[PDB]
Design an enzyme around this catalytic site. Sequence first.
Site, PDB file in Angstrom:
ATOM      1  N   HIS A  89       0.809  -1.252   0.000  1.00  0.00           N
ATOM      2  CA  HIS A  89       0.000   0.000   0.000  1.00  0.00           C
ATOM      3  C   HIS A  89       0.840   1.301   0.000  1.00  0.00           C
ATOM      4  CE1 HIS A  89      -0.144  -0.060   4.592  1.00  0.00           C
ATOM      5  NE2 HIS A  89      -0.287  -1.374   4.353  1.00  0.00           N
TER       6      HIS A  89
ATOM      7  N   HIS B  96       5.455   6.938   6.401  1.00  0.00           N
ATOM      8  CA  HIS B  96       5.141   6.477   5.067  1.00  0.00           C
ATOM      9  C   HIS B  96       4.540   7.650   4.304  1.00  0.00           C
ATOM     10  CE1 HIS B  96       1.475   6.132   7.348  1.00  0.00           C
ATOM     11  NE2 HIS B  96       0.870   6.470   6.218  1.00  0.00           N
TER      12      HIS B  96
ATOM     13  N   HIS C 175       1.693   8.946   0.931  1.00  0.00           N
ATOM     14  CA  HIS C 175       0.612   8.747  -0.034  1.00  0.00           C
ATOM     15  C   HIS C 175       0.927   9.673  -1.203  1.00  0.00           C
ATOM     16  CE1 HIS C 175      -1.726   6.608   3.126  1.00  0.00           C
ATOM     17  NE2 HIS C 175      -1.115   7.478   3.940  1.00  0.00           N
TER      18      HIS C 175
ATOM     19  N   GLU D 242      -3.896  13.107   0.979  1.00  0.00           N
ATOM     20  CA  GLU D 242      -5.111  12.634   1.616  1.00  0.00           C
ATOM     21  C   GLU D 242      -5.902  13.817   2.157  1.00  0.00           C
ATOM     22  OE1 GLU D 242      -3.897   9.140   4.073  1.00  0.00           O
ATOM     23  OE2 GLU D 242      -4.766   8.133   2.279  1.00  0.00           O
TER      24      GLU D 242
ATOM     25  N   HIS E 232       3.183  10.956   6.406  1.00  0.00           N
ATOM     26  CA  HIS E 232       2.599  10.656   7.704  1.00  0.00           C
ATOM     27  C   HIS E 232       3.683  10.104   8.624  1.00  0.00           C
ATOM     28  CE1 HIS E 232      -1.592  10.281   5.753  1.00  0.00           C
ATOM     29  NE2 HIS E 232      -1.275  11.526   6.025  1.00  0.00           N
TER      30      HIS E 232
ATOM     31  N   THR F  48      -6.097   6.217   7.966  1.00  0.00           N
ATOM     32  CA  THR F  48      -6.628   6.379   6.609  1.00  0.00           C
ATOM     33  C   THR F  48      -6.540   5.098   5.781  1.00  0.00           C
ATOM     34  OG1 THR F  48      -4.645   7.158   5.588  1.00  0.00           O
ATOM     35  CG2 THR F  48      -6.027   8.847   6.644  1.00  0.00           C
TER      36      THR F  48
HETATM   37  C1  LIG Z   1      11.058  -2.270  19.056  1.00  0.00           C
HETATM   38  C2  LIG Z   1      10.738  -2.478  17.585  1.00  0.00           C
HETATM   39  O1  LIG Z   1      11.493  -3.066  16.785  1.00  0.00           O
HETATM   40  N1  LIG Z   1       9.740  -1.731  17.079  1.00  0.00           N
HETATM   41  C3  LIG Z   1       9.389  -1.621  15.703  1.00  0.00           C
HETATM   42  C4  LIG Z   1       7.917  -1.503  15.429  1.00  0.00           C
HETATM   43  C5  LIG Z   1       7.064  -2.730  15.654  1.00  0.00           C
HETATM   44  C6  LIG Z   1       5.587  -2.508  15.344  1.00  0.00           C
HETATM   45  O2  LIG Z   1       5.483  -2.094  13.974  1.00  0.00           O
HETATM   46  C7  LIG Z   1       4.245  -1.534  13.548  1.00  0.00           C
HETATM   47  C8  LIG Z   1       4.210  -0.722  12.437  1.00  0.00           C
HETATM   48  C9  LIG Z   1       2.993  -0.191  12.011  1.00  0.00           C
HETATM   49  C10 LIG Z   1       1.802  -0.505  12.668  1.00  0.00           C
HETATM   50  N2  LIG Z   1       0.560   0.054  12.313  1.00  0.00           N
HETATM   51  C11 LIG Z   1       0.385   1.288  11.750  1.00  0.00           C
HETATM   52  O3  LIG Z   1       1.280   2.151  11.900  1.00  0.00           O
HETATM   53  N3  LIG Z   1      -0.894   1.601  11.282  1.00  0.00           N
HETATM   54  C12 LIG Z   1      -1.271   2.816  10.692  1.00  0.00           C
HETATM   55  C13 LIG Z   1      -2.199   2.829   9.638  1.00  0.00           C
HETATM   56  C14 LIG Z   1      -2.523   4.040   9.002  1.00  0.00           C
HETATM   57  C15 LIG Z   1      -1.918   5.241   9.362  1.00  0.00           C
HETATM   58  S1  LIG Z   1      -2.257   6.724   8.571  1.00  0.00           S
HETATM   59  N4  LIG Z   1      -1.151   7.601   8.917  1.00  0.00           N
HETATM   60  O4  LIG Z   1      -3.577   7.153   9.000  1.00  0.00           O
HETATM   61  O5  LIG Z   1      -2.249   6.487   7.034  1.00  0.00           O
HETATM   62  C16 LIG Z   1      -1.005   5.201  10.449  1.00  0.00           C
HETATM   63  C17 LIG Z   1      -0.711   4.032  11.124  1.00  0.00           C
HETATM   64  C18 LIG Z   1       1.865  -1.343  13.798  1.00  0.00           C
HETATM   65  C19 LIG Z   1       3.058  -1.855  14.247  1.00  0.00           C
HETATM   66 ZN   LIG Z   2      -0.865   7.466   5.958  1.00  0.00          ZN
END
Ligand SMILES: CC(=O)NCCCCOc1ccc(NC(=O)Nc2ccc(S(N)(=O)=O)cc2)cc1
Ligand SMILES: [Zn+2]
Length: 257
Positions: free
Chosen positions: A61, A91, A93, A103, A116, A195
């Site tokens: 995505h 990331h 868009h 967005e 974002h 989003t």
């Molecule tokens: C210690 C270690 O090594 N840590 C490293 C990270 C591990 C977890 O990784 C992750 C990485 C990402 C996620 N989910 C997201 O970020 N979802 C999200 C979806 C849409 C938006 S937006 N901005 O509205 O388009 C923003 C956020 C969950 C865990």
């Molecule tokens: Zn985003």
Amino acid sequence: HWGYGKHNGPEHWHKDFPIAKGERQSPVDIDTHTAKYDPSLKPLSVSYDQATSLRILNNGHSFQVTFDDSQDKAVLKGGPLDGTYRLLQFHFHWGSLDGQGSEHTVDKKKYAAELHLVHWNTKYGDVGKAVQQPDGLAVLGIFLKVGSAKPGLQKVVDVLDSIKTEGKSADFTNFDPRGLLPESLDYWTYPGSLTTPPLAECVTWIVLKEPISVSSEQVLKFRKLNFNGEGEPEELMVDNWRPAQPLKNRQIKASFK
Ligand SMILES: CC(=O)NCCCCOc1ccc(NC(=O)Nc2ccc(S(N)(=O)=O)cc2)cc1
Ligand SMILES: [Zn+2]
């Protein structure tokens, strides 16, 4: 399953994620004349000096740079926020052409792209818990326009060839996200959502007024990415933006007059 195409795009998301038609969805159009200047809003505190980037990933995505979020290093505070939010990932868009890609919109104007920077509230301990809370995430949104190059983006641009297709990732250490920020931290803020699916209503949005400029060559490199995995038909990763959603009973506040 979900994506940005005719048969799986934003107009379809509500079937798997009914919150898509909720009361605080993102993005929205920012009507600059209706946003209320709020003199109680604090300056935003962006502390990225000790940020530790880990990896860059094509997730089908977008492309996503991940940070070590296991300690308070890179944190967002102040502004409309209560407490401390750890930087998790950023990331973008973007569009197929320069007149679309963002967005959020500003008086219906679309920018070529939107960055974002995603942070989660330390009082919930981990991002998975934070996305279940109305004040769990803070996303700092920064518009991109096309003109002069952004030097601080070039390290990102130069590794995209290595993550062309869905599921590819690479080491991406020592990236300094301060190089992606505009001069001004003047912002709009409102309560909203992710989003992308699951479209959780967990985000305090902080959208900067000042865009960054990137070069045509930089944004062309975004548009060479692929939505598909290497064993599927080539489909350029472009127009990975959700359109503006109904504002409903929300107020957008400006940090500036
Ligand atoms: C210690 C270690 O090594 N840590 C490293 C990270 C591990 C977890 O990784 C992750 C990485 C990402 C996620 N989910 C997201 O970020 N979802 C999200 C979806 C849409 C938006 S937006 N901005 O509205 O388009 C923003 C956020 C969950 C865990
Ligand atoms: Zn985003």
